[PDB]
Amino acid sequence: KDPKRLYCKNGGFFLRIHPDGRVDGVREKSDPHIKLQLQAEERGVVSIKGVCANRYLAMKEDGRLLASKCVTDECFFFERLESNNYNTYRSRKYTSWYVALKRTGQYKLGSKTGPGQKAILFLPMSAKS
């Protein structure tokens, strides 16, 4: 229902979405650019929206993460609650690729992701008006 924030296991960054479509991560939990709307577009599938940015998280055919004003099919991810109780966000289009952040706060390229990495593990937080 309410806005949330995606906390990454890799280093402790919040997934961030800039107004200009850029995606990155920050430790600052008050940065308004970390508020996200996860919409259940279907069972096991969510679209990830930056509230302030008014943009949708997206994954490109080359591994690139960016935020588009337009919702599209590169905008869907499978949300899965892993056995460790962290969530993972896997591209519904580019099926072996996950949303992830490097220990540097940069996002990690889709193509370099896979199961077992910290970079992929996130923990949603929040709820609120």
From Swiss-Prot:
Expressed, tissue-wise, as follows:
Expressed in granulosa and cumulus cells. Expressed in hepatocellular carcinoma cells, but not in non-cancerous liver tissue.
Please spell out the taxonomic lineage of the organism that makes this protein: Eukaryota, Metazoa, Chordata, Craniata, Vertebrata
- Binding-site list for heparin: N10
For the modification Phosphotyrosine, which residues carry it? Y56
Q: Where in the cell is it found?
A: Secreted; Nucleus
Q: Where is this motif: Cell attachment site?
A: 20-22, 62-64
Q: Which residues form a coiled coil?
A: none
Give the record's PTM text: Phosphorylation at Tyr-56 regulates FGF2 unconventional secretion. Several N-termini starting at positions 94, 125, 126, 132, 143 and 162 have been identified by direct sequencing.
Q: What does this protein do?
A: Acts as a ligand for FGFR1, FGFR2, FGFR3 and FGFR4. Also acts as an integrin ligand which is required for FGF2 signaling. Binds to integrin ITGAV:ITGB3. Plays an important role in the regulation of cell survival, cell division, cell differentiation and cell migration. Functions as a potent mitogen in vitro. Can induce angiogenesis. Mediates phosphorylation of ERK1/2 and thereby promotes retinal lens fiber differentiation.
Substitution effect: R27E: No effect on integrin binding
Belongs to which family? Belongs to the heparin-binding growth factors family.
UniProt name for this protein:
Fibroblast growth factor 2
User: Which residues make up the annotated site Important for interaction with integrin?
Assistant: K102, R103, K108
Q: Where is this region: Heparin-binding?
A: 102-118
Q: Which organism does this sequence originate in?
A: Homo sapiens (Human)
Task: Summarize subunit and interaction data from the UniProt record for this chain.
Answer: Monomer. Homodimer. Interacts with FGFR1, FGFR2, FGFR3 and FGFR4. Affinity between fibroblast growth factors (FGFs) and their receptors is increased by heparan sulfate glycosaminoglycans that function as coreceptors. Interacts with CSPG4, FGFBP1 and TEC. Found in a complex with FGFBP1, FGF1 and FGF2. Interacts with FGFBP3. Interacts with integrin ITGAV:ITGB3; the interaction is required for FGF2 signaling. Interacts with SNORC (via the extracellular domain). Interacts with glypican GPC3.
Cross-link Glycyl lysine isopeptide (Lys-Gly) (interchain with G-Cter in SUMO1): located at?
A: K69
Further notes on this entry?
This protein binds heparin more strongly than does aFGF.
Query: Highest taxon of the source?
Result: Eukaryota
